[PDB]
Amino acid sequence: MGSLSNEKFFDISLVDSYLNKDLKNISNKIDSKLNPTSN
Amino acid sequence: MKIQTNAVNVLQRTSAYLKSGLLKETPAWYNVVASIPPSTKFTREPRFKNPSNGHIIGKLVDVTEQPHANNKGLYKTRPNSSDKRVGVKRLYRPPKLTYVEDRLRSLFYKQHPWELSRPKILVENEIGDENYDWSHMLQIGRPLDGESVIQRTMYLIKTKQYGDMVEAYDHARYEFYALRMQEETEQQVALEEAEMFGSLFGVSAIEHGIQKEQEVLDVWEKKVVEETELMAARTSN
Amino acid sequence: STSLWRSSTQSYIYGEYKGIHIIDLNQTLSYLKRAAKVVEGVSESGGIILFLGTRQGQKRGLEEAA
Amino acid sequence: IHVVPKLPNSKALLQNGVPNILSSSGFKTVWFDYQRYLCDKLTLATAGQSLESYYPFHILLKTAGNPLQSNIFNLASSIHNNHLFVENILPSAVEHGTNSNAVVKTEPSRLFLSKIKDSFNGSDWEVVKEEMIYRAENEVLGQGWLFLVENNEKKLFILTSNNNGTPYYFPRNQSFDLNSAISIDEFATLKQMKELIGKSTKLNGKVQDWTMPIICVNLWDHAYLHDYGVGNRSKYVKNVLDNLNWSVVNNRIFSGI
Amino acid sequence: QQTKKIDQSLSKKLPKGTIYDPFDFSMGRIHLDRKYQANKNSNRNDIMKSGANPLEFYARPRILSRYVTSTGRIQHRDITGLSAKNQRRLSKAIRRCQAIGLM
Amino acid sequence: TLAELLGRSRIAQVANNHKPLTYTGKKFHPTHQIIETKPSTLYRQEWGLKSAIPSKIKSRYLVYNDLDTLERITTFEPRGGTQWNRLRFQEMGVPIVSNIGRQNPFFKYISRPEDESHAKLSLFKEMKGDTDISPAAMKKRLKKITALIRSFQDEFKEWLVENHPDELKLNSNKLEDYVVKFLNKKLETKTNKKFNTEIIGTGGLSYSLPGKLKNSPNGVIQRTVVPGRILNVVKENNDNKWLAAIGGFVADVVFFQSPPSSFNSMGDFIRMKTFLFEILEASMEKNGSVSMHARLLEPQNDKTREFFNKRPIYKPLTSRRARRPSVGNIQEANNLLNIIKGN
Amino acid sequence: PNTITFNLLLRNVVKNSHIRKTKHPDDEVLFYLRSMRNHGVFADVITWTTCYNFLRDEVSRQLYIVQMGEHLGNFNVNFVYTVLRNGDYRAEDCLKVLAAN
Amino acid sequence: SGKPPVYRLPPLPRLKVKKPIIRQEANKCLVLMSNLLQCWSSYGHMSPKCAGLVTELKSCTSESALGKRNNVQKSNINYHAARLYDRINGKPHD
Amino acid sequence: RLNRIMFENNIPGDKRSQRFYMKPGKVAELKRSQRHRKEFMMGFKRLIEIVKDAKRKGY
RNA sequence: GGAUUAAAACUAGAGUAGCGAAACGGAUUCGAUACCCGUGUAGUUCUAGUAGUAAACUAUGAAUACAAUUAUUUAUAAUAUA
Ligand SMILES: [Mg+2]
Ligand SMILES: [Mg+2]
Ligand SMILES: [Mg+2]
Ligand SMILES: [Mg+2]
Ligand SMILES: [Mg+2]
Ligand SMILES: [Mg+2]
Ligand SMILES: [Mg+2]
Ligand SMILES: [Mg+2]
Ligand SMILES: [Mg+2]
Ligand SMILES: [Mg+2]
Ligand SMILES: [Mg+2]
């Protein structure tokens, strides 16, 4: 599950995603499909 | 020991005898051995291809031939020690013959241990007089063993009706079960017919085993009484 | 078995299987043909052919051949 | 491998069949089809086993005692009995070649006639034949075999076998059908057979016997149904009885010299 | 009747479900199994041969006491069955435990 | 050519085996392939192996491990009786019932598609294949699996975000359930059909179907009576059953409410005598063992009516009437709480 | 002797403890487990629950039950009755705990 | 250390058991003597109850005290070893 | 049981040895000799077992 | 050339239980300047140093390239069900 980990003891992939904006990028992508696009 | 020299040179020593005059009459084997020269090399002989699997013995894969990256993520740019060292020993060491059939055979016999209990005759008989079409497992002149399953599996693989080996093995074993079912049912039904129509049997397997157990247990009885006498005597002391 | 291999016979080995060496039947057949020819040659020459086998059970074959 | 033996004049038997007894198609069914079926069945049954090296007769003798080996016993018995039957109904035992062997028909020997005389209260061979057909039609309710056999007492007698029995070995004669009702005397016969078996002094559970077959007739429908049809097995047996290879029968008889 | 009670030294107790042969009843079977009596339960249940580091147990006198005699001496490798490395580490741990005083 | 022939040779058909020839532990099924010889070959000491078996071996059967050894001898044993045990079992003719386990292995079914049972545990088992050494063997297998799943990381990412972002934004356990399902199908992919060594079916002991009847001249057979022996005069300690030797197999024997006085008379020597047993059932166990239940048959003809005796086999659970109500405290606890309040 | 013989003895020790006019029998109990260990008999929930009765302190009983789950992995109506009886729970307390169970 | 190691001997001039031990049979006559004397010790000198044992010893020592001798048994392991040593020693090929 | 305990712990032989002093070199040579003799005895046991088995199987 | 170099030795401090050259007594002997027993010095111990020899031996100086086979144990490398 990688950066999508919800476990207490995450791995370095979460920090990598932060420094890469990967998590924020995916989050805004999905949110833009959800609320603005109504999907 | 030494690669001896005189046994293969009997002819020349006898020829020297004859020419010098030591021996008057020429031996009967003289001309025969002269016409049929003996083998006289006695040399080691290198081998390059294993005939069982087909692997080639005596070839490297140089750096130029692995331009891609290794499983660890590195590009091999220089020879490793294993390559740098010589390997003449491999050429002269007899190859280890290997077959993909052995894995299947072992798997079958550790899935069906009691199949080992069905006796197998290991004395061959004209192994060059077998004509088997392995579309069907039943073959004239051979029993219904695990080798039938193996040969059926490799026929399926060779003629490409299935993919990986487990599919063909599964199909072959599911045919094997049906054939065995038929056989055992035939055995039981024939026995019941004979007993219906009045066939009489002197001894059955169970009572044969009982007889053997009795012939063992009598000896066990005598041994136990004698030993218990001995140990009672020792304990009393 | 491999553990009793005499290295001087390295030319007659086809491989090793089940923990024992396998002789090359092609070489066996060639050498057997030559041996048969030489024994036949002495037979015509009228010589004396002596078959020697001491291991148990070989008497029948030796006697029949002789 | 057990392969069907080559019968003499096979071309003749295949083209027209045995005369006065079976048609070409019927003889095809009885031998070139049934024997092949039986032999392949036996080969598949006994492949990879010590029994593969023995003839059917020795196979049945060895397997008689063992209960579970009933398939191989029955197969071997059927093969042997069928070959016995076909051999005794062969027209010409030996191929004619350049000799006119067909000019003379075979007849029973005076020794055989005397044997019948002593064995059946001095009754005629035709009387014995009619009694034989009566017994065959009255005893064998389904498939089976009919035998005229000779025992160690130097006296012939008649034996009826159900399905696949053997004249040679008496506990496997299969003479009695226990499916239907049975009589007190027959039950006593089975009981004394059991006692004689119990008298055996070997782990193999075998009892000596020397009942040899002089004449054999197959009652399996594979032989008669095609030509004679349902319910005409009596006529079929009559016909085969009247037409036989008395050279073979006499050779089976024991001369003593 | 005669003597009616016997010990277990010479009477084979067949386990349930196990397949057997007539020979098992003979006196020979008892000699054979006493001759080939190998303690494979120890092989299965031994922690050291499992793979764990023997030196890791230096604070476990209870575990270490199973590899010493009653008096406290250490069994030879022929008895313990351990590898050379495992035996050396185990003796090292034992001797240490003795030094600290836990054992 | 020659290697191709050797592959099919009869010697090659025997699977490699080096398990002990002399073994004292519990035995549940055969461990070696029986090699036999015809009388003609036995007379000439030929068995088909490399060496000629010595003359004093008068039996036509044997087992072996090595064709030749450094000691210039063939490791063999003039034995082989598991064939006789199997034939005796066939004589007993009690088919093996597939208790608990459904879907008799010898038959193909279409029920496998119905695979919904805690697949995560099975996948954990399959990952932990190298069960030998926890710090080394399972560790390296786990590392291999870890590399594979790191490689498969990204596809799961997109698949989840595309399918069920709702589970992501609600941070529910459906997420881990979906991980299980995803890896399940990735394990259904190729290179995963795998080979299983686990004992399937009877293992060749018998190929029988439950349901067919045995017919005898005295009428269709209703009960199977076979001889046997009593090993222990006293039932197993803590247990209410004895052990009996029946056709090569030890069976759990029950008593008809009374041990025969022959037991008290013969004591520990009871193995000498033979008794009659009726096989109730035969079943299997995961270890490959065959567990068969038998009942002792003591003829009660011209005996007492077994009065002044208790019932040993009798269920007190014949209370389906009591089962009809819940009796789970779910509502009884409510009633009792009402009592606590005072009603 | 079987398991029953030993556990029967325990009941005797329970009688002594209930009417304690002698030394504390804990050492006798220990001696008897040593005896049954030497005899090789296999323990059973009955023997275990008897020991539970022997226990005194709450954390001890807690460890007893948790160890039970670890190794024996089986409970019974007898044991739940035993714990309810021994815990000195009020009537409503027993009611609530059994309802939850 | 999967299984215990196997130890090989060097080339030896001979394989021989110096003194072979034989499973000697116990002698009931000395057993009788021992049990009679033990009975005297247990139940007093000249125990009336063991007069039967006195009679058994009487019978077993009426003639030669040892009893009777049928055969003297000793092993043949030395012969078998001498015969099989060269074959089983696994020496390198000559 | 006492006797077996002391025999298996080699208490008696140890007591006999400790009565007098021996040089380290002599101790080492004695240790090597004893180990060799034990090794040789185990090997001889194995060979005799092989002989007995071969006799039992007819070789 | 240089450094290290077991016992036994030697120069200074401390230390000295046990063992033990010498020395004095027991015994054994024809004698016994010894083998055995008793009391025991110097030594054996630690710290500073001096000296650089032993059956200091594998009686075999070091390095490099090669040559036919078996067994065991050692580490690491996987067929892959293991
Ligand atoms: Mg380099
Ligand atoms: Mg220099
Ligand atoms: Mg030193
Ligand atoms: Mg000083
Ligand atoms: Mg002195
Ligand atoms: Mg210096
Ligand atoms: Mg000097
Ligand atoms: Mg010098
Ligand atoms: Mg040295
Ligand atoms: Mg050097
Ligand atoms: Mg250097």
mmCIF file of C-alpha atoms in Angstrom, chain H residues 10-86:
data_model
loop_
_atom_site.group_PDB
_atom_site.id
_atom_site.type_symbol
_atom_site.label_atom_id
_atom_site.label_comp_id
_atom_site.label_asym_id
_atom_site.label_seq_id
_atom_site.Cartn_x
_atom_site.Cartn_y
_atom_site.Cartn_z
ATOM 1 C CA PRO H 10 43.116 -45.768 7.944
ATOM 2 C CA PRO H 11 44.311 -48.821 6.014
ATOM 3 C CA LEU H 12 44.565 -51.571 8.598
ATOM 4 C CA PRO H 13 46.536 -54.836 8.405
ATOM 5 C CA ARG H 14 43.513 -56.749 9.703
ATOM 6 C CA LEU H 15 40.032 -56.335 11.151
ATOM 7 C CA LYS H 16 39.789 -58.547 14.214
ATOM 8 C CA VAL H 17 37.891 -58.730 17.489
ATOM 9 C CA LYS H 18 40.416 -59.636 20.175
ATOM 10 C CA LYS H 19 38.030 -61.369 22.595
ATOM 11 C CA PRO H 20 34.484 -61.951 21.261
ATOM 12 C CA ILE H 21 31.787 -61.892 23.941
ATOM 13 C CA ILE H 22 29.134 -64.605 23.611
ATOM 14 C CA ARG H 23 25.560 -64.542 24.924
ATOM 15 C CA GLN H 24 26.190 -67.201 27.551
ATOM 16 C CA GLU H 25 23.156 -69.111 28.805
ATOM 17 C CA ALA H 26 22.218 -68.887 32.478
ATOM 18 C CA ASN H 27 22.615 -72.077 34.523
ATOM 19 C CA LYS H 28 19.550 -73.133 36.485
ATOM 20 C CA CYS H 29 21.599 -75.242 38.913
ATOM 21 C CA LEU H 30 23.549 -72.262 40.250
ATOM 22 C CA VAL H 31 20.300 -70.281 40.111
ATOM 23 C CA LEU H 32 18.775 -72.923 42.396
ATOM 24 C CA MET H 33 21.745 -72.780 44.760
ATOM 25 C CA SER H 34 21.554 -68.991 44.948
ATOM 26 C CA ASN H 35 17.814 -68.894 45.578
ATOM 27 C CA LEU H 36 18.008 -71.652 48.205
ATOM 28 C CA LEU H 37 20.723 -69.804 50.106
ATOM 29 C CA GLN H 38 18.735 -66.569 49.812
ATOM 30 C CA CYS H 39 15.680 -68.388 51.192
ATOM 31 C CA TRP H 40 17.729 -69.619 54.141
ATOM 32 C CA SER H 41 18.838 -66.043 54.787
ATOM 33 C CA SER H 42 15.296 -64.678 54.441
ATOM 34 C CA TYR H 43 13.369 -67.235 56.526
ATOM 35 C CA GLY H 44 16.075 -68.584 58.828
ATOM 36 C CA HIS H 45 18.634 -71.333 58.428
ATOM 37 C CA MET H 46 17.191 -74.585 57.070
ATOM 38 C CA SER H 47 13.914 -72.979 56.055
ATOM 39 C CA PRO H 48 11.180 -75.665 56.139
ATOM 40 C CA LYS H 49 9.293 -73.995 53.286
ATOM 41 C CA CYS H 50 12.233 -74.278 50.850
ATOM 42 C CA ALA H 51 12.740 -78.021 51.282
ATOM 43 C CA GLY H 52 11.553 -78.177 47.681
ATOM 44 C CA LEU H 53 14.418 -75.924 46.604
ATOM 45 C CA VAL H 54 16.775 -78.135 48.601
ATOM 46 C CA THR H 55 15.491 -81.107 46.593
ATOM 47 C CA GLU H 56 15.909 -79.273 43.284
ATOM 48 C CA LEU H 57 19.525 -78.446 44.128
ATOM 49 C CA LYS H 58 19.980 -82.052 45.268
ATOM 50 C CA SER H 59 18.879 -83.235 41.837
ATOM 51 C CA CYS H 60 20.895 -80.688 39.857
ATOM 52 C CA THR H 61 24.146 -81.416 41.754
ATOM 53 C CA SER H 62 23.769 -85.173 42.285
ATOM 54 C CA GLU H 63 26.172 -85.709 39.378
ATOM 55 C CA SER H 64 28.833 -83.213 38.194
ATOM 56 C CA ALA H 65 28.199 -79.942 40.018
ATOM 57 C CA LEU H 66 28.125 -77.721 36.929
ATOM 58 C CA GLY H 67 25.303 -79.799 35.448
ATOM 59 C CA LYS H 68 25.687 -81.001 31.867
ATOM 60 C CA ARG H 69 27.504 -79.605 28.834
ATOM 61 C CA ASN H 70 26.066 -79.887 25.317
ATOM 62 C CA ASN H 71 28.290 -77.480 23.374
ATOM 63 C CA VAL H 72 30.556 -74.466 23.865
ATOM 64 C CA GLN H 73 29.486 -71.428 21.847
ATOM 65 C CA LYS H 74 31.699 -68.729 20.355
ATOM 66 C CA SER H 75 31.239 -66.214 17.574
ATOM 67 C CA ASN H 76 32.385 -66.225 13.938
ATOM 68 C CA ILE H 77 32.719 -62.447 13.580
ATOM 69 C CA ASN H 78 36.470 -62.801 13.132
ATOM 70 C CA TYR H 79 35.941 -65.031 10.096
ATOM 71 C CA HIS H 80 33.289 -62.788 8.573
ATOM 72 C CA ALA H 81 35.405 -59.676 9.153
ATOM 73 C CA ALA H 82 38.479 -61.294 7.626
ATOM 74 C CA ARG H 83 36.349 -62.220 4.622
ATOM 75 C CA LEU H 84 34.606 -58.852 4.088
ATOM 76 C CA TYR H 85 37.178 -56.285 5.257
ATOM 77 C CA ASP H 86 38.876 -55.794 1.897
#
